[PDB]
Amino acid sequence: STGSATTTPIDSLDDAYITPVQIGTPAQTLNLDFDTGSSDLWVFSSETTASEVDGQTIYTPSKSTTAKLLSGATWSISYGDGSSSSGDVYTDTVSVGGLTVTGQAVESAKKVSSSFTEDSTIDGLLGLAFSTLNTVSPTQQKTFFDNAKASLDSPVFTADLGYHAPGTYNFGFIDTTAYTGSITYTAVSTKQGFWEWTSTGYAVGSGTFKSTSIDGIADTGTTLLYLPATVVSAYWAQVSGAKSSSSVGGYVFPCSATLPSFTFGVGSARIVIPGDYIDFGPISTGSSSCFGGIQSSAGIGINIFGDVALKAAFVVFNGATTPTLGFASK
Ligand SMILES: c1cnc2c(c1)ccc1cccnc12
Incomplete structure (x- = not known):
């Protein structure tokens, strides 16, 4: 199988790129920042503190028929720029440009730092670094890429980012x-x-x-x-x-x-x-x-x-x- 999705800069400076991701059944589309420097798939959700949400699309696990609470699992991340987020974990179906993974860990944010709150165009992150960096405790979880690997025609993903223009993330082919x-x-x-x-x-x-x-x-x-x-x-x-x-x-x-x-x-x-x-x-x-x-x-x-x-x-x-x-x- 393969996957192909368009990525778009959030502003005129290309400060970040967002890619639409479908989570749950029926699909809830969230615009995520594909991050090859981290390994957590985390999103703004119905559980995030109301005051820390400013325009983001939230994921609602209660509306997904395939969502499952991963009993007792927690996550906590502290990024390089002093930003942080934390919460509980669900498993759900996740698709990127037609490529579907079932039972992907979706980290629901309960708390987010102010720099995430301020970026209303980013609904969460999709980590593409190696699964050893995943913060889920006590049971570490696999990235979307690691979970898709067996199904892919080739175990590769490509990044083709545009300069002041849309680009593409492709999974499974060159x-x-x-x-x-x-x-x-x-x-x-x-x-x-x-x-x-x-x-x-x-x-x-x-x-x-x-x-x-x-x-x-x-x-x-x-x-x-x-x-x-x-x-x-x-x-x-x-x-x-x-x-x-x-x-x-x-x-x-x-x-x-x-x-x-x-x-x-x-x-x-x-x-x-x-x-x-x-x-x-x-x-x-x-x-x-x-x-x-x-x-x-x-x-x-x-x-x-x-x-x-x-x-x-x-x-x-x-x-x-x-x-x-x-x-x-x-
Ligand atoms: C003043 C200070 N830092 C920045 C800018 C302006 C503009 C863009 C940017 C992108 C990443 C990191 N810092 C900056």
Whole structure:
């Protein structure tokens, strides 16, 4: 079997992407953020504290004939940006673009932190990292991808994110018309539970490529590209007037400046991120200072190839016995 669904940016900056997901019988459609950096499928629900819901579509397990309370199971997640959510667990039928999984753990949120409440367009998250990161206690649960794996024609999912435009998430097959040239595959380490890989270097604009190993994670749930301080400093040194601002919390640049492109290595292949993709607009309404899409990972502890980098490529997440990541130009 296969699945194919369209993903759409939530705003004009591509801060996040939402993909419609059908949960329960009869179907309840919720717009979820597909996150390859986490492993919990959690949603806003009829059980969420009324004051913490601001416009989201909620899942109502009492209206689903296939919903089952997973007696005594609880979940609690604390994301990298200080955001958190927690609640109880149900099992229910979940479908993504025609691909159906029965008995998928659906984590019903009882409490959500304010940053989730503020994003009215995001109804929950669909975790696509490895199942060892799932927070369900006392019995850890499998991701949607892990549950679908046996049924898929091929144990892969692909991410084709658009720049200020809709894109596609495909499950079970590789669309050979969605990319140009060939796909370069690279090794994945699953030790921390992430799609962790090693980039072979980088270039700023039309400069010389610097061969250096950069260990990072392919993360669809992170908006920006977080790289070591040395790399980020070399990029922003090429932008007149760019500087690191502690009040803003990162590198900012004059909105009138033209940004150079950024190249990252995947084996012997090169993926070019156009400079326009690194512009995240004014820091505040009316400001002539703009926020950069390439930031330091020094305070994070891990390098993250977020939406800024992934949207410049066709990306294959190969969940075979020995997992790999594929990258192609598009
Ligand atoms: C991810 C993280 N921080 C940001 C954005 C996206 C977009 C705009 C912005 C403006 C000021 C400060 N941070 C951000």
